[model samples]
Target: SAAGEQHVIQLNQQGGKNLFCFPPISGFGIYFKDLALQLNHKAAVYGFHFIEEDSRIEQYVSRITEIQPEGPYVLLGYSAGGNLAFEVVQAMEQKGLEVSDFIIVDAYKKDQSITADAYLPEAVRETVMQKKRCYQEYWAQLINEGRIKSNIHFIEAGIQTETSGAMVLQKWQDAAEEGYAEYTGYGAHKDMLEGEFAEKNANIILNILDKI
Candidate 1:
């Protein structure tokens, strides 16, 4: 995209101002600068910044888009980040924006129904109550109500030995109107993009992109 088209960028799952996902430290993707050594090196990587100050979905989308205006866009959202990604796709389709791919990682529906397990992160356990509230309830409602004609793919925490964060995706596991046709993954939910798991997970995504 010499014309300045943007590539894969992500929105952190929970709407937090903290440097949440794979912060540019020793994290696998962080180890990569200017290119994704594990996947599509040619495609630039980016993520949206969310502050607690604004919970309005429109505001987040507007600001994130400014950083990545021109597309054929590919978006990635993990957990509740998938919740946000679905909303962003709907918003962009309103103005006729092009979203090439959506990689939703372990974000589920009936989040209200999930039995809070001991391994659940506090940030996540807290959300169990909030999803019942209007704050996140609206997102779940909108996602169910909105559907865009595109390739909606799910990358759940497909793992063997149970880890800290890898259990379920009631909402993510199901959804076809969004054109969800493929399912792939790496490790447990929490560790999928960490440590050696990061190395193992990169190919799952690359293989998926190759077919597309």
Candidate 2:
């Protein structure tokens, strides 16, 4: 399932092959429909689901079990969704279910510190705070238990901000003439799942799954 207020898409391909891509906190999975479509054609992509950041974890687990109740499954998560995916995998293990693989793409470490409140708009502070708390709690436990390691790949990117959208537009407008580079930096929320960063992360996932 996805994260935040996003709709679900059903692939409905034949064969038992399936994959789930979860979005980051305050983000949605629908943004990647193009990419998902590409991958779906290569495999029997069952469907996609999205969840809200404020929703209860138990609710997510129940929904997941209901969606795919059979054995041998793969769970893929990006950014904040990565952390949630980890918890879901752990939860399923406790229930004696066999998970084929758990893949986290460019997800932050559980202990990674972020000061998003200082940069985000005030209107979204409450939602961002909820995400921070959720991550902190999960990271603390993962670190305490020594479950986090360097094996998890981390992708870092740059960000640029302007007071006026017009000014930012002007920068892009002159890109070709100025020989300017894009990807000035990560966006407030959308950056985590875009550009070469996401591509590299996707490659890592492909490599891992190839081995399985």
Candidate 3:
């Protein structure tokens, strides 16, 4: 199967792998352990615990490559995590590594940066904003320098969103560098991580890997 014999690592956010605080408060679950296992039960998956030392994109590029040094690599990132995913490939491809695939689900562009038409549990709100800012800056850097030049497959939630892309094609169109394939799945941007949709998303990835 396309998902087998590979290491899958997701980007980090906030204080830990778990969002720490969630919807109505945060509107998303940050970790994807069960989500990762959707690829393959035997696959070694990491939620990639967020550490202060692992704060920046270049830093994470170094750390993640250290963990899984060879190919059969598939990096999945959601929302802001997609920013890291893009930057990771930019960094990795430059390092002479082959990224087997980049799977981005529900990513948005700069003007679309997440904000409150919405709030927080006060403390949680501030922390979330900070996390979003950190990645947004990295994302800007990626865009400014035209960093991503590799093949990319992006998935967008069927509906338009305040914080996420409206369509897979549009996201691909908005890509700063160019030449990215688009995919679509029905549901909220956050719903792709849910059980059935996660498997569907996994299968799309699996099929893609099979072709390659």
Candidate 4:
């Protein structure tokens, strides 16, 4: 049921500001429910879910804009969703929508290899692997076409390789113009959105929202 139907979910509804979240490869906005709670104090959180890995960037843009017709938008995503979030911002910016804050947690374009979970059912595992490749190819296309004019912040938490974290982040910084990155010292990508890590990441997100 991961890719059941692509749509946007309103994670929280209490604040005036709007923040859109992109789903990770699982295509479940529920992944962000806790993060949304942490942020709902200042902004209503809307997250995209049931996302097909091969889905077009325009589809995500459309789903988001349908919720709040315009910007200055604050966007947050982790892992695959993080990559989607940046491209979505660029697409929105091209339409003259103002993107105020772009926060990505532990996602980098160049890192595409995945460790298949042995615990997953066979069908689900196949689907996830297929989606990972699709995302990888899509991001590669974006890079070759030189699509990095949008500004966004990347937060690095785990180790991809010896220099993987630092390497991809430099590329992002260069492409985003004013964009830079921060290292969170969290355990790994899997632990990023849970408990203490989630709280810390939420604080970082809140700080950026307050600043911009």
TM-score of each: 0.59, 0.54, 0.62, 0.74
Whole-model alpha-carbon lDDT for candidate 2? 0.48
**Per-residue error (Å), model 4, residue 139:** 6.2
Runs in model 1 lying further than 4 Å from the true structure: 1-37, 40-42, 110-144, 160-174
For model 3, the local distance difference test gives 0.52
* Per-structure clash totals for the candidates: 2, 8, 1, 0
User: Candidate 3's residue-wise lDDT over 155-207, tens digit each?
Assistant: 77765566423432346455535456778765687677676676777566656
Candidate number with greatest TM-score = 4
- Model 2 alpha-carbon drift over 4 Å, by segment: 1-8, 11-16, 44-55, 112-204
Tens digit of lDDT per residue, candidate 4, span 22-63?
Answer: 777766677888887777776777877634455467777777
Write candidate 1's Cα lDDT for 30-103 as tens digits: 33222143343423445443222234456555655665566655666665556656666667667787766666
- Ranking, TM-score, top scorer first: 4, 3, 1, 2
Worst 10 residues of 3 by lDDT: 16-25
Locate the minimum summed-lDDT window of 10 residues in model 2: 172-181
